[model samples]
Target: NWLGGLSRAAFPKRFVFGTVTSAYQVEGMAASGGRGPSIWDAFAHTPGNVAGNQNGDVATDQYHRYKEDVNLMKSLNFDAYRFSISWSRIFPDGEGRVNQEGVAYYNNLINYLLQKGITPYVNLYHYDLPLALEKKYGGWLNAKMADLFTEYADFCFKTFGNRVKHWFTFNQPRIVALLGYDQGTNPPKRCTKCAAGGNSATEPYIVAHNFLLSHAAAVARYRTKYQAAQQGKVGIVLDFNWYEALSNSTEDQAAAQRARDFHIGWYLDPLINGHYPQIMQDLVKDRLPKFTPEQARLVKGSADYIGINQYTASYMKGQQLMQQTPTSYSADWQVTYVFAKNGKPIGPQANSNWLYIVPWGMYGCVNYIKQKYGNPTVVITENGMDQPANLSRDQYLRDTTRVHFYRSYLTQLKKAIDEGANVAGYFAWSLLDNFEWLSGYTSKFGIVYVDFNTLERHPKASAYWFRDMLKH
Candidate 1:
């Protein structure tokens, strides 16, 4: 019962298990590897943006220690490593000339993973956009971005697609639109109230529209040019917080449905249904962008698989109180988010206040997607919890809570799978603790403990937990 009586047998025979990370999260050689400045570089350097004023100028030194990291994966029996590429690294200015050194590094990383008999799952974008793109055309706010992104993703498919079989065009596009454009907490820092000057009521939709266009454009290019020869899979990564209704009242139920529609359906519906949700069309009205006839067809089947990264759960109730006007995307959901019911927390709260440990959310999330999207091919791209960084190395090393977190969640995931969810694989949130955005180094979210001072990789009990669970 070490793993809730789950093992390799809990999943489909071909279902892979892996760990996920992004280039900006773990790749430390931020500047020296012929990499151009990403929006994260600009944001993290701006003193007040990140916690403790920390930056990823040198995070875990994975740039130079990838082999050691990959070996650790093989030791733990992880099937693959899902990593993102920093656009700024490959295209110094986000376009024009290729950075051969940047290309060589990922080429090296991909080949090494292959040599180790570990597969490589590559995601093209993960929040870290080239600052040059933001400066040049307001980043995702402009239609021009769609063409630019296709060019960038085209390069990736051409260069790495032959060796990398799985692909994600972007990670959590909703988060980029919500945090960056609407809430103004992330890079570019645009919102109704932010000094950077953006209309939160509208820019989020505009940015999201651009993302869909870019994603569809990239997917089309891959299928047309590379899919036949390379035969790689394509998908987009989405993160979700399973939102449940506070009560079964009609209004609360509708609010919870609206929450799901606005969150995942914002992207999923468009990709699968070829149009935005009817609820959004009614509420957002003119602010939302519509896909033209031809583009709708192009976007409908772009994703060969759906990559969902679910972490926590929340309760939703119709705005019985907010008392504020629905001026931005945050308020537009017309629901109040609750983590507790009857003074009971959703589950255990993690070091990151945003994360609540609700194991059943895994079951809820997967089932929702399976039922809603007609049982499409699915991959649990990223899932795990974080811990506060105020612990001794020894204390962090003994992560029994995280151990329980994985088993409890995996048990729920198994429940979803057994019910015919069509899940292709599962990936733990992280292999090593790296730069967690906004929280910076103040929060730890890795199964592998990273010594900030020594950059030493020490597998925590949860890593050992996975090792034992996966070993036959």
Candidate 2:
């Protein structure tokens, strides 16, 4: 039963294959194990915030179920398992004191994975900063918060570097900047009203500058103090959607580049070149955060590789920018999207109104990353579909649309490789249906379906599909 086997030798020998999940999304015990509240905790509990008003206070119970999950991965013969360490779980207070219980938990998990010969790829901040930090320093908007992140990152390296080989600084910086900062859509939602009101973009960009600095600092520390001893690669994950101009008109093209520069360039330029793009500098108008020479030294060329998370593409047409509106909702105060008609979006529509499948977008995005970011090694950190919870389990699981989505997008990836994109590997969206942000547990995005009522795990047809695919 080869079932469309991929030739192993045709792909890179060192390619990694795995699935990804976040702690808060899967590991319940939101109120257990001395774990302090994250912004997610607050958001989830805030009435009318999450779909169905559900909270992760009792997610998949992965806090107590990791062993079984690891066993599941082992059964699949997975070469790697990607997961995030809840910041609140680690420091509880975001600084100074550490939680021994949280430390022990991750340490044990990392050790167990190593024992099974599964490489553990850990991300430091995965959208869950300790609420303690937000109360003390307004989270990423405050420079002091970056200092806290560096210390936390250092702590992770010093403690787990002995076992973990792949390290990611942040999961998706743009999402944080866009969702958390610009738009008041996420936790600690802040609004500046309008250009006639407050200078809004300034805060997020400043926070982003510090985020870059902190990431650079952590990588610098690793390269100097831990690389030889730990033998790991340190990088950051950037979530980006490729932008194509609606037309060859200069204005449209400029709009497309401006959008890309503000989103992708905001993080990548600083990490790879040590400065923000001039396009952003010109668009933001005195709101662009400054990078001193010293900070630039720390930030530029700081990453060993760049982890890319791609899902879709945007067609750009011109639109008016407004003040006081969130940057994430629109563009960086200077751009707007008019859905490009670059073929139909890939997968079936999920419950969430926001996401659409454009699998081909993945291929274009990866190629764009290779050319734009100087071919820094790219690992697709996250990409998958989301469906409504009430859907037929089998139809949802087998999800021919998702299967087509993957095959089509991955086929584009194969083409990109043939054309010389230094793409590395891919990690599917998730292992199990867990608490999705804002939407709560109402959406399903897992290969393995979970019976929420009984905490039972059911391997979907996609699970077998993926497992069989990996066997090659």
Candidate 3:
């Protein structure tokens, strides 16, 4: 009785449903298919970089078995497939010549997805930057990277835009900026204290500024060149965690507000209002890049719709009372991130350390968007929990917790829609358990389980839950 007798009819008519995956996370052929290496390939290959030092060198072989995967989506009753294109795959060195094999692979994918009646929501990038760009000119730190990214996106539009109607410019740019630049945990790892070497305060700001510009530029390109003829929508995927105050005191409340301002508002304010949030400007000052008037016009209202990857929530408190500064973006937020208040946990722990099963977070996330951003068209582009990969196949196939996770979250999602949040779609985080970055394969977040050795697909119990829940 999870979905409590509800089905697709429970959602707004024409609301979309799908699953999400990135190229580096799913499609294998990291070395073949005429693909050039992405920053992720180099990062995951480096010793001690990813858990178990695992790489996507052959991630569940989706590149070789996309047909099986598409058929699985059809069986699950999904209406769309959300996947990203590896920039390096299409332009072998970021830009120079087309990789025909790579082009052919996606043509087959788009065509097959359409044939199966699964609409494709193609994302242009998802953390996997073309390594050539990083090595050639310091990646996002260089403003020139924006123009280069436009060239690559232009190629995608000219080549595949006619077939793919929905496109995301980037997935979770916040994660890319802070993790890679401020903390140096991910690719091109750079931070003040990191061995790869970068200014914690300055570089994250510059990288975010450039990447945001690139997103706007790509959207501009599509609206001007492809949208009228190809009839598609362009947007960016943002990761947001609901932040609630740990205490009722004004200080804690202010801290929670600051955390929200720092999180999505950092990107959205610039996009919606043509400037950074006032709180951010007061704190970061010159470290935060300012947009020129023309750039402001370009970014403000850049997205045709905004895609959010919502999963968990955290309780936060004023940093003054909680902890010492760690510097960079984290320090700038002036809040302590916590999972619990007093002795009560947010909800319960999932397989991933950061993922707490706080279903109400979903309610808060969408409502916040409706209140803060004036209810623009939004999609919950990535939602779902992970299970530990070390669990036996028997245990992995059961997946009751994942089923409950979706039920609870979707209940909240429905509540938000009733409250007038203009949410237009929902997509699960993954289709099959492939290579999870950094944590590598230690965490499994798929509705379908894929055997790493034999690469056979097995639908877990949650998959059937979806099949039943989505039936008309």
Residue pairs that clash (backbone atoms under 3 angstroms), model 2: 193-324, 194-323, 194-324, 195-323, 195-324, 315-340, 345-357, 346-357, 346-358
Model 1 lDDT per residue over 1-472, tens place? 7788988987789789999999888998998889999999999999888999999899888999999999999999888889999999999899999999999999999999999989898999999989899899889998999899999999998988889889999999999999998999998899999999998999999999988999999999999999999998899998887999898898888899999999999999999989999888978878899899999898998999999999998998885533455599877788888767888888879998888999998999999999988999989999998989779999999999999999999999999999999999999989999899999998898999999999999999999999988885
Give model 1's TM-score versus the native structure.
Answer: 0.98
List, in order, the clash count of every candidate structure: 0, 9, 0
Question: What is candidate 2's lDDT per residue for 1-472, written digit by digit as tens?
Answer: 3233353455677778788998889988787788999989988897898888999999999888888888888777678888999988888888888889999999989988888878898988888989989888877777776668878888999988888889998888777766666666777675466322223456677667778877887888889888988888998988888777777877788788887887788888888888898777766766777888998988998887788877777677755544544343245646656643556433345566666666667777877778887887888888777768777656666666666666666667777877888877778888889999887888888877888888887777666766776774
lDDT of 3: 0.90
Model 1 clash count equals 0
How much does each candidate deviate from the true structure in C-alpha RMSD?
Answer: 1.5, 2.9, 1.6
lDDT winner among the candidates? Answer: 1
Q: Hey, what RMSD does candidate 2 come out at? A: 2.9
TM-score of 3: 0.98
Per-model TM-score, in order, reads 0.98, 0.93, 0.98
Compared with the true structure, what per-residue lDDT tens digits does model 3 show for residues 101-190? Answer: 999999999999999999999999888888998999889999998789999889999999889889889889899889999889988899
| Consecutive 10-residue window with the lowest summed lDDT within model 1 | 317-326
- Give the whole-model CA lDDT for all candidates, comma-separated: 0.91, 0.78, 0.90
Which runs of model 2 end up more than 4 angstroms from their true locations? 1-7, 194-199, 319-333, 340-348
